[PDB]
Write a protein that binds this ligand. Sequence first.
Ligand SMILES: Nc1nc2c(ncn2[C@@H]2O[C@H](COP(=O)(O)OP(=O)(O)OP(=O)(O)O)[C@@H](O)[C@H]2O)c(=O)[nH]1
Ligand SMILES: Nc1nc2c(ncn2[C@@H]2O[C@H](COP(=O)(O)OP(=O)(O)OP(=O)(O)O)[C@@H](O)[C@H]2O)c(=O)[nH]1
Ligand SMILES: Nc1nc2c(ncn2[C@@H]2O[C@H](COP(=O)(O)OP(=O)(O)O)[C@@H](O)[C@H]2O)c(=O)[nH]1
Ligand SMILES: Nc1nc2c(ncn2[C@@H]2O[C@H](COP(=O)(O)OP(=O)(O)O)[C@@H](O)[C@H]2O)c(=O)[nH]1
Ligand SMILES: C=C(c1ccc2c(c1)c1ccccc1n2C)c1cc(C)nc2ccccc12
Ligand SMILES: C=C(c1ccc2c(c1)c1ccccc1n2C)c1cc(C)nc2ccccc12
Ligand SMILES: [Mg+2]
Ligand SMILES: [Mg+2]
Lengths: 427, 431, 136
Amino acid sequence: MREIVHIQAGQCGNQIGAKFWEVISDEHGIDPTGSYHGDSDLQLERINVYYNEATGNKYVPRAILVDLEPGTMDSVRSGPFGQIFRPDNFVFGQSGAGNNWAKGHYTEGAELVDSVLDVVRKESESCDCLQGFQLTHSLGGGTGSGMGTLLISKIREEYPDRIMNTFSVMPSPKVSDTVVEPYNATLSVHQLVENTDETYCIDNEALYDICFRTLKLTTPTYGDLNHLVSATMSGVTTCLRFPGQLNADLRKLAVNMVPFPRLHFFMPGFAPLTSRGSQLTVPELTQQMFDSKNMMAACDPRHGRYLTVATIFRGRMSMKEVDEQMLNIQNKNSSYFVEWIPNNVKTAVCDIPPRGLKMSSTFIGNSTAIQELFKRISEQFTAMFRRKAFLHWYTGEGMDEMEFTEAESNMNDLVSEYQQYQDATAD
Amino acid sequence: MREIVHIQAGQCGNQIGAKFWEVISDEHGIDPTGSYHGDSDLQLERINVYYNEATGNKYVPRAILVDLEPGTMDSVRSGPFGQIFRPDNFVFGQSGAGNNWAKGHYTEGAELVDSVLDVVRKESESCDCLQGFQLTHSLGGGTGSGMGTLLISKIREEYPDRIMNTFSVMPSPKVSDTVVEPYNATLSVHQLVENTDETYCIDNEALYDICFRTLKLTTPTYGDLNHLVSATMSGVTTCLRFPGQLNADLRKLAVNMVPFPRLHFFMPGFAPLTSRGSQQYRALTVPELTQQMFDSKNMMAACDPRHGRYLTVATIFRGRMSMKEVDEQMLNIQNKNSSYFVEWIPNNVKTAVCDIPPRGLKMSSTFIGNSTAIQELFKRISEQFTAMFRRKAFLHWYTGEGMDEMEFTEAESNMNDLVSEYQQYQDATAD
Amino acid sequence: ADMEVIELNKATSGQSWEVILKPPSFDGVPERRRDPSLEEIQKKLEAAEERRKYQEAELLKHLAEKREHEREVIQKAIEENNNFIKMAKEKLAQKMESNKENREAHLAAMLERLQEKDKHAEEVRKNKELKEEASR
Ligand SMILES: Nc1nc2c(ncn2[C@@H]2O[C@H](COP(=O)(O)OP(=O)(O)OP(=O)(O)O)[C@@H](O)[C@H]2O)c(=O)[nH]1
Ligand SMILES: Nc1nc2c(ncn2[C@@H]2O[C@H](COP(=O)(O)OP(=O)(O)OP(=O)(O)O)[C@@H](O)[C@H]2O)c(=O)[nH]1
Ligand SMILES: Nc1nc2c(ncn2[C@@H]2O[C@H](COP(=O)(O)OP(=O)(O)O)[C@@H](O)[C@H]2O)c(=O)[nH]1
Ligand SMILES: Nc1nc2c(ncn2[C@@H]2O[C@H](COP(=O)(O)OP(=O)(O)O)[C@@H](O)[C@H]2O)c(=O)[nH]1
Ligand SMILES: C=C(c1ccc2c(c1)c1ccccc1n2C)c1cc(C)nc2ccccc12
Ligand SMILES: C=C(c1ccc2c(c1)c1ccccc1n2C)c1cc(C)nc2ccccc12
Ligand SMILES: [Mg+2]
Ligand SMILES: [Mg+2]
């Protein structure tokens, strides 16, 4: 289990995807020309997971950049790390998706999907031991949402024995591009429930509130939100990228984090929460796992129970202090952990802190509280669907009202399942 | 009827066997190179019974050393008299018996048994007049027990007209090597009842108690126990080895000691009882030596002679003593303790006197008794056996070698039948 | 009630005579069996030899039965070991085949679910053509 093939789809997908590559290249000592200039042998031990080794001791992200709109990938190319990507790995269309899931999934996206699969095939065939796929996309739009989920199902058909991991960004009216975001997100969730092994729920409602309430940013931009996403994405992938201690891979993460196949939606958490220019103790970092204020998904952990938790501590710290502190949180907050999954919290420590931070903590949680996020999207969806508002945008692309009904009930079924395990006691 | 072929099998068998050869070689004036250096012609008159005469006026024990484990015979070879044995007479395997009677009797032992019989054949064919076989072994382990009894039955088939004599050492929890000892001993006793002419019951329970209670040794070792065994083995064989009054061979011993074929288990007794460090004693007169025949404290089998009746007794007095005093004293014990002798076997006590005392002693007495009290030893083994067999504990180690549970049932009832027969004669009155 | 010395014989190395103290109380004198032949003796000796020969023969016959039992035990241990090997071989073959079948069936069902989606997508795009260009 070595190589991960990274795919970024749509405006949101390519924006957060670029920021991920900028952040992890800095950690690994890779400059925008692909050259290594670090001073630690730990930086290069597992470089092979995300980078291909090119001639002249250079490293190239194993990344595929997809969009139906050409504009976004021009912005990527001109960005800080724009030149680091393989030019042939940029698969762009010319007519966008118009924030319509149907356009991305059935029309414009269906026409570009074969061109993308040709590039995924070329990357994947070159792998010694393919772990699987990591996809970045938003669920509110049309390319990331519709085309991204069409890509997932097509890759699922060609590589059924590989892990499908996504960083899916949930829509919010607090940061809204389109009125049909509840439809796009519901149609996508339906696809993710069925076709992914593990999904990180990056909620724009949570990111907006972190910026506004905590960071006191009156008017946050996508740049402000994306700073929190890149910090989380770096934290959550630490154990795939760095040696020890444990030798984590995506299947190992899936096996230990997912007790029921459909319940694979993770509620990420991060500490400390900072703004795009900022340059804390072990007990302080540990306490932020129950803090609703630190969650990347708009849910209160204390409104559910954790099925499983994987926590990453980064920086030079006492590993003994971490162990003591983590056990303390479990003993003091026992009622927020399911008793029928023994020893359901796992901790990892990495000597390398992320950029601009001396100490950090990331929480990957499989909590029943994530139902609050799915209930929120469902309420918004129903307000609109009840009145058949904007439906002609979708039916115009050939979709049936039936597909909306089916996706809605599949998401409500997902909610009921989270409730079932929240009420379940050890007998 | 001159030569005896000696066989020693297993760990215990070789330990007590080596000690027998060290002790009798000293008595006969044979040094570890096989050379004679004594000052009595009585020492060489009957040397031919246990020793083969080799070139250069040397003497070689007519001994066969057997084991499934190679280790023990290396310990023998390195011992005091290790160099005295014929090198070709060492028959050792490489995988032991894992203290399992089935392994010794049917598996590992069955594979080595032909190699042993080839060596017995070579010794026996060279004999002018073969008396028979003398086997040393324990009944608690795998080789001595299982393989030793397989050897007995194979020798019985090839030499049916020769005497089979054993020195069989009985297990006790007081000195235990393995948990499966009661099974191993029961399966062996069954074989001994059927295939031996005469057996000396050397009981480790009796040896432990002599060391602990009498010799006041807090923690006795195998060495302490084996000191009593070698003294007994020397005493019991005196009349086969030394000239005097009766001559004596293994058949004559069997004929006069065994009234019923199955009742051939002898309860040996010795006086004085000494330790290795006991370099005194300044003790024991003829009346004192004679009194020790009813003393339970002097028995090499854990049985009280006073709990049964003697069918027959053979008594060896060793050293310079009044033969008239011995005769008077022995008659006195029979007249005073009349109720402990069966009345339907007239004049059932025979006495022998040998001028040569054993080493470190100036006067000794050995008793070979065929007493009904030996049923106590067999009842003890049977109780231990049933405690385990009732629960079928460790049985798979035996059935795994191909044995049937039936063989366990049969051996147990044959030993209980042996007990009832001893009882039958204990209650039998002269009518 | 007297005595009577009656001279018997006198030779060079000695003399002999009979002395009668009192005559017998009964005047009229007191108040072997053939053969046995060599054949009779031979018969008795040979009958004993045949009894000894019978006893020894019957004891060897008992031991012969033991050798047979010893071979039967060894053979049983071989048979039990061979049966263990064969049962373990068959049970393993069954597990490996049942598992291959289950894994194949899981993958088959997964790909069928995705194939259903592909058939539905054709229908969606077909339904779009029935609307578009069809009306203005
Ligand atoms: N005592 C001890 N336990 C270990 C060691 N390595 C792993 N374990 C324990 O073994 C269990 C996990 O087994 P592993 O040996 O790591 O697994 P594996 O056999 O390599 O199998 P996979 O990694 O799942 O392919 C846990 O209880 C670990 O604590 C070690 O060197 N010593
Ligand atoms: N008077 C006397 N009796 C003897 C003599 N030798 C043996 N006896 C007695 O004879 C009886 C035993 O008979 P033995 O003559 O020794 O024996 P054997 O007939 O040669 O044959 P085995 O019994 O086969 O030894 C006993 O009562 C002995 O006391 C002897 O020289 N003189
Ligand atoms: N956090 C974050 N959300 C974004 C970003 N760009 C767009 N979004 C969200 O994505 C949704 C619209 O999808 P978008 O990616 O722009 O469209 P697509 O190109 O058709 O996939 C809305 O919910 C936006 O709030 C971004 O860079 N960061
Ligand atoms: N008296 C005595 N008993 C011994 C000696 N060594 C072992 N034993 C006994 O022998 C039994 C075990 O048999 P052992 O001879 O060691 O095993 P084998 O080699 O498989 O025949 C136990 O009852 C032990 O007490 C020894 O030298 N002297
Ligand atoms: C492999 C894991 C992992 C996850 C959750 C787990 C276990 C192992 C586990 C073991 C014993 C008991 C409970 C357990 N739980 C709930 C992993 C851990 C961490 C801290 N971070 C990761 C980051 C990337 C990939 C994988 C990981
Ligand atoms: C031959 C015997 C022997 C045994 C018991 C006997 C008789 C003879 C006997 C004769 C007349 C009446 C009763 C008799 N009983 C009970 C013998 C005796 C002794 C003292 N020690 C021996 C040591 C080695 C070999 C043999 C012996
Ligand atoms: Mg391993
Ligand atoms: Mg004679």
